[PDB]
């Protein structure tokens, strides 16, 4: 019993994190099979971040200016390529710690852990979710670029997030293992806004079926709703929309705890219009989103 | 910039991790050198844990009954003893994965990193801290026990916690790694009631700190106070007395903030005293005591 916000273990995602130099800019690489990938910005001075033309930067590197260091022991760099917003550098070492894995797109709402690191060592690991306007809240000071958020399916690692930017309001836009941006951001030191941070409902309710299974239940009501009205509310309270793919995907905890997932929307409900008065879920005074159906199953149920 | 609940990366504690079995009981040991270290009511059937005479159950267990897997390969037992509550089998294989490693005896307030592991797996990894009446708020199911708390100092890994019992209120207790229990608590199926669970003081200031760092200064007010005066307002809402040794330990936050500490406790007893009114300060609708002055000063600093 208990729920805690849980990273993976990092352990397989440690022995992938590389220090990539490019003149004076080190950031962290990741390091699978005989490729490094890092963030393109490697290559830029921070003049050139307010403007990068990135294919023009790139033409003046050379494999020799990419300085990839494991540990205490350089990688030869043998190839360089531009994939998106990340950089591709072929070394003639492949990683032997190299775990399974796959590079996959989250969708917003999806949740995954971050092992922050600097010049390539690993500083912690925490639990994140890709936001709904496809930023996240991380913690990421100088260096911590290249970082790389995971998630774990048995023995395979599933990379779904590379760390590139801090926005000027102090969240966090990065990239696929592709160098594809989640969201609209792009790799420029400019005024980029993101838009309206929504609560992922469908979260709050597998975390609120988490709170029943671990025995705090005082917030559950006699009421129940439709996904209709239900969804008013949301809209209100800028609340995702509930679809049935949501209800389909709550099912097992529905089923599990007895709670039918309507119920448990009018539970919510009560707590959007009445608040928390003071007392708490889990040990915290606010909803939590940052858990996924998934996330409460494999947790209540200790998946390794 | 933002602030995030880390855990240490687990990688060299994940490479410890065994699965013990003693009969029908299957939970998690640490091994380190050529020593299997796990909870001594291993030895328990459920039915013993009511009244369990461990030196007598032990007379009856012999090496070959302690059945030692490290992934998927037998490790051989070639002696046993029980200190205090933990098991130390000795293996005829030295971990070749053993880390740099301390055991150490943590004081309550100080925080560490769970590998919580079931069947010698680990499943996942969070943060922790000791709390004043000497349990912990895991996420513990059953086969959790022999899952293991440790700080990492660079390269060296300070275990300080061994996860035994969930408390009928399902709060955690657990020992060192010389198997003295923290607080009051013993390995056996019994009415055990934990005292009074108090806020750490230190770490709210230590993580108000962070919160101002951060940009969140909404809660900083004109006033100051005293340590005598402050003091009252902590034990009227079970804060931890705060102490000179408190005062002293965020010097270095005090000093790269330009708030004095007693500022900071007069921004705290506005805040018990006038609650959040529905704000939040780092995301959160309550005052977090799971971050030491340490864990901030190596967080905003972004230590590996
Ligand atoms: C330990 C764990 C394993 C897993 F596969 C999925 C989730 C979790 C817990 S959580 N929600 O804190 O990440
Ligand atoms: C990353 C990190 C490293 C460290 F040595 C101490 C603390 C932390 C951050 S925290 N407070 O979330 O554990």
């Given at each position: 019993?208990?729920?805690?916000?849980?990273?993976?273990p990092?352990?397989?995602?440690?022995?992938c994190?590389?220090?990539?130099?490019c003149?004076?800019?080190?950031?962290?690489?990741?390091?699978?099979?005989?490729?490094?990938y890092?963030?393109?910005?490697?290559?830029?001075?921070?003049?050139?971040?307010?403007?990068?033309?990135?294919?023009?930067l790139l033409?003046?590197?050379?494999?020799?200016?990419?300085l990839?260091?494991?540990?205490?022991?350089?990688?030869?760099?043998?190839?360089?390529?531009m994939?998106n917003?990340?950089?591709?550098?072929?070394?003639?070492?492949?990683?032997?710690?190299?775990?399974?894995?796959?590079?996959?797109?989250?969708?917003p709402?999806?949740?995954?852990?971050?092992?922050?690191?600097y010049?390539?060592?690993?500083?912690?690991?925490?639990?994140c979710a890709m936001?709904?306007?496809?930023?996240?809240?991380?913690?990421?000071?100088?260096?911590?670029?290249?970082?790389?958020?995971?998630?774990?399916?048995?023995?395979?690692?599933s990379?779904?997030?590379?760390?590139?930017?801090?926005l000027?309001?102090?969240?966090?836009?990065?990239?696929?293992?592709?160098?594809?941006?989640?969201?609209?951001?792009?790799?420029?030191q400019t005024?980029?806004?993101?838009?309206?941070?929504?609560t992922?409902?469908?979260?709050?309710?597998?975390?609120?079926?988490?709170?029943?299974?671990?025995?705090?239940?005082?917030?559950?009501?006699?009421?129940?709703?439709?996904?209709?009205?239900?969804?008013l509310?949301?809209?209100?309270?800028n609340?995702?929309?509930?679809?049935?793919?949501?209800?389909?995907?709550?099912?097992?905890?529905?089923?599990?705890?007895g709670?039918?997932?309507?119920d448990?929307?009018?539970?919510?409900?009560?707590?959007?219009?009445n608040?928390?008065?003071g007392?708490?879920?889990?040990?915290?005074?606010?909803?939590?989103?940052?858990?996924?159906?998934?996330?409460?199953?494999?947790?209540?149920?200790?998946?390794?």
């Amino acid at each position: 019993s208990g729920f805690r916000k849980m990273a993976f273990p990092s352990g397989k995602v440690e022995g992938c994190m590389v220090q990539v130099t490019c003149g004076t800019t080190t950031l962290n690489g990741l390091w699978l099979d005989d490729v490094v990938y890092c963030p393109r910005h490697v290559i830029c001075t921070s003049e050139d971040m307010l403007n990068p033309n990135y294919e023009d930067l790139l033409i003046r590197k050379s494999n020799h200016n990419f300085l990839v260091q494991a540990g205490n022991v350089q990688l030869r760099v043998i190839g360089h390529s531009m994939q998106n917003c990340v950089l591709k550098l072929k070394v003639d070492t492949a990683n032997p710690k190299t775990p399974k894995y796959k590079f996959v797109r989250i969708q917003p709402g999806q949740t995954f852990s971050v092992l922050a690191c600097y010049n390539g060592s690993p500083s912690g690991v925490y639990q994140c979710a890709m936001r709904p306007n496809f930023t996240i809240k991380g913690s990421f000071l100088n260096g911590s670029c290249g970082s790389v958020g995971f998630n774990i399916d048995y023995d395979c690692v599933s990379f779904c997030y590379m760390h590139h930017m801090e926005l000027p309001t102090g969240v966090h836009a990065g990239t696929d293992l592709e160098g594809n941006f989640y969201g609209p951001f792009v790799d420029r030191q400019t005024a980029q806004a993101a838009g309206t941070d929504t609560t992922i409902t469908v979260n709050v309710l597998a975390w609120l079926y988490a709170a029943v299974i671990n025995g705090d239940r005082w917030f559950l009501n006699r009421f129940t709703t439709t996904l209709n009205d239900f969804n008013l509310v949301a809209m209100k309270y800028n609340y995702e929309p509930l679809t049935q793919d949501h209800v389909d995907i709550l099912g097992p905890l529905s089923a599990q705890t007895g709670i039918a997932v309507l119920d448990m929307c009018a539970s919510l409900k009560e707590l959007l219009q009445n608040g928390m008065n003071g007392r708490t879920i889990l040990g915290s005074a606010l909803l939590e989103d940052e858990f996924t159906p998934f996330d409460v199953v494999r947790q209540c149920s200790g998946v390794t």
